[PDB]
């Protein structure tokens, strides 16, 4: 029914605005919408989005999983507050160690924009804490770019996972948990707002897009990230010179990392990351499949690529998705219909990218109801995990900066 279409598509739709200062919208960010569509049961992307406390920035991911949620998931909850620790000053870390230590009150680190059906892990709240603990002080003993920070943010979150793998946990679940978090793998698409400044770090085949108005109305798609996949040349070479020459043939094969992966960047995934031994060693430890040619691992990293970009009068908006929306559209179409929809050419620009993604004939916003009431099994035959995130700038305060 059109009714149960409309109750189907808005049910993880969400939307946030910037809140005015006195009166008036004084942010770069006006708001964001941001929609998800399941393709498999338990869906494996995930979206998040939240406000720096202790600096000024705004940070949203979209995060593709793959064999599981786990990872999808764990990031997902993780790497903003990696980031955020790593955008600290020391003045702010110490404070926040002090407060630790003597047990005062803690320094907020983060505003987090969820909707209702995305969650935190209660069971492992006590272990990511202790881990950007130890991070944190680590960073206070070794005592600001952006670009690096988020480097550092992404390769010391997956280290950490790695680690908290081999390390376990008394607790059968947390230990499961543990696991399953670095045996299954995600991508990682994050967007860092401070004012007119704008990063962009990428790791994996997830995409963000800039969208740009020109003078006569007309809509173009800038690229902010590269995916990380077979079509991608200078990945390719550089997983090609990463090994020996001896490996230029098997490092990608079948457009797949080692034949296997799609994504050439990713979290988890410690199967093309640790050792043959390691992961003989963890696998027969409790609770198994060498990839081939696995000569001179590790293969895989989650070390993105960091694009910056001085947001103009002329960016209107900043699309982030997983490719259950890039396979289905053209970059120029989504542009095109995220501008025309909010310049008034549904109430939620993410909600009706979906709804043209799964219903489209030449761009017809018919089979929506017969795409949609599919179960789980026939549905991913049709389409992948859908994950949209729509940021739209306020024109009037970029231009103030000039
Ligand atoms: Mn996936
Ligand atoms: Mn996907
Ligand atoms: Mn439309």
Not at 35 to 44: D, H, T, V
Not at 194 to 213: E, I, K
Not at 348 to 359: D, Q, S
Request: glycine share 6%; net charge negative; proline share 5%.
């Amino acid at each position: 029914t059109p009714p149960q279409v409309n109750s189907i598509l808005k049910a993880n739709e969400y939307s946030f605005k910037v809140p005015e200062f006195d009166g008036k919208n004084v942010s770069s960010v006006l708001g964001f919408d941001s929609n998800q569509l399941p393709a498999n049961a338990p869906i494996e992307d995930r979206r998040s989005a939240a406000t720096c406390l202790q600096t000024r920035g705004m940070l949203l991911g979209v995060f593709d999983g793959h064999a599981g949620c786990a990872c999808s998931q764990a990031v997902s909850e993780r790497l903003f507050y990696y980031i955020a620790v790593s955008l600290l000053p020391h003045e702010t870390l110490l404070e926040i160690e002090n407060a630790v230590e003597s047990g005062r009150a803690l320094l907020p680190i983060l505003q987090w924009h969820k909707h209702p059906n995305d969650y935190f892990s209660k069971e492992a709240s006590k272990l990511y804490f202790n881990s950007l603990r130890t991070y944190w002080q680590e960073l206070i003993d070794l005592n600001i770019d952006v670009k690096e920070a988020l480097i550092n943010a992404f390769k010391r979150l997956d280290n950490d996972i790695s680690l908290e793998a081999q390390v376990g946990d008394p607790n059968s679940f947390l230990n499961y948990l543990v696991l399953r978090v670095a045996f299954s793998g995600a991508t990682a698409c994050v967007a860092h707002v401070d004012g007119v400044d704008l990063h962009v770090a990428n790791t994996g085949d997830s995409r963000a897009m800039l969208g740009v108005q020109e003078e006569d109305g007309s809509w173009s798609a800038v690229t902010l990230s590269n995916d990380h996949n077979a079509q991608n040349e200078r990945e390719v070479e550089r997983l090609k010179l990463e090994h020996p020459k001896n490996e230029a043939k098997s490092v990608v094969k079948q457009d797949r990392l080692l034949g296997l992966l799609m994504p050439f960047r990713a979290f988890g995934d410690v199967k093309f990351k640790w050792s043959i031994d390691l992961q003989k060693r963890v696998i027969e430890s409790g609770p198994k499949f060498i990839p081939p040619n696995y000569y001179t691992p590790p293969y895989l990293t989650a070390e993105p690529e960091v694009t910056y970009h001085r947001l103009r009068p002329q960016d209107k908006f900043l699309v982030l998705a997983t490719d259950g929306l890039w396979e289905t559209m053209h970059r120029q179409d989504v542009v095109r219909i995220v501008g025309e929809y909010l310049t008034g050419m549904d109430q939620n620009a993410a909600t009706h990218l979906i709804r043209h993604a799964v219903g489209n004939n030449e761009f017809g916003a018919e089979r929506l109801s017969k795409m949609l009431s599919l179960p789980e099994e026939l549905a991913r035959m049709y389409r992948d995990d859908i994950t949209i995130i729509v940021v739209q700038f306020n024109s009037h305060v970029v231009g103030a900066y000039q």
